Amino acid sequence: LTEEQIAEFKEAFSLFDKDGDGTITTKELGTVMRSLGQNPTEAELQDMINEVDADGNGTIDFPEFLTMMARKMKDTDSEEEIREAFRVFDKDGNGYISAAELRHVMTNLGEKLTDEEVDEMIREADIDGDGQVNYEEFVQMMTAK
Ligand SMILES: [Ca+2]
Ligand SMILES: [Ca+2]
Ligand SMILES: [Ca+2]
Ligand SMILES: [Ca+2]
Numbered sequence: 005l006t007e008e009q010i011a012e013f014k015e016a017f018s019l020f021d022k023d024g025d026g027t028i029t030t031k032e033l034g035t036v037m038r039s040l041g042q043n044p045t046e047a048e049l050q051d052m053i054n055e056v057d058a059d060g061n062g063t064i065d066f067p068e069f070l071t072m073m074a075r076k077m078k079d080t081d082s083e084e085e086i087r088e089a090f091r092v093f094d095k096d097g098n099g100y101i102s103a104a105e106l107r108h109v110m111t112n113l114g115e116k117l118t119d120e121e122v123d124e125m126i127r128e129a130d131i132d133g134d135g136q137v138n139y140e141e142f143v144q145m146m147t148a149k
């Protein structure tokens with residue numbers, strides 16, 4: 005939204021628009037992606053351009069780049085908030101919330117649950133059935149429908 009945000013987003017855009025013509029080609033995108041230690045396929049590059057290319061003209065302009073960037077920033081903010089909450093649940097940092105971690109967290113907060121109840125909570129959220137709650141499960145359990 006801000007003139008300041010748009011200047012910052014114009015700054016990011018320029019790194020992609022290697023020749024300064026106001027558009028990003030699949031090539032340019034590739035150059036940038038390689039310079040970041042990535043080797044995307046030609047098909048991956050086209051997909052990424054296709055996903056941003058609102059007008060379908062084959063390249064991405066700054067207006068299209070602003071739309072994409074403003075969404076990516078809302079997504080990232082959201083991922084960083086859910087993630088900081090997952091790190092709090094996951095005491096020993098192994099990437100999984102256990103029944104004992106969940107119980108301890110509710111209890112330090114105040115709300116005491118039994119092992120029975122905590123096990124039910126883990127089972128509800130444990131999509132892949134590994135007895136624990138990974139990040140993807142934790143995000144889904146905040147959503148479900
Ligand atoms: Ca260009
Ligand atoms: Ca376009
Ligand atoms: Ca853990
Ligand atoms: Ca699981």
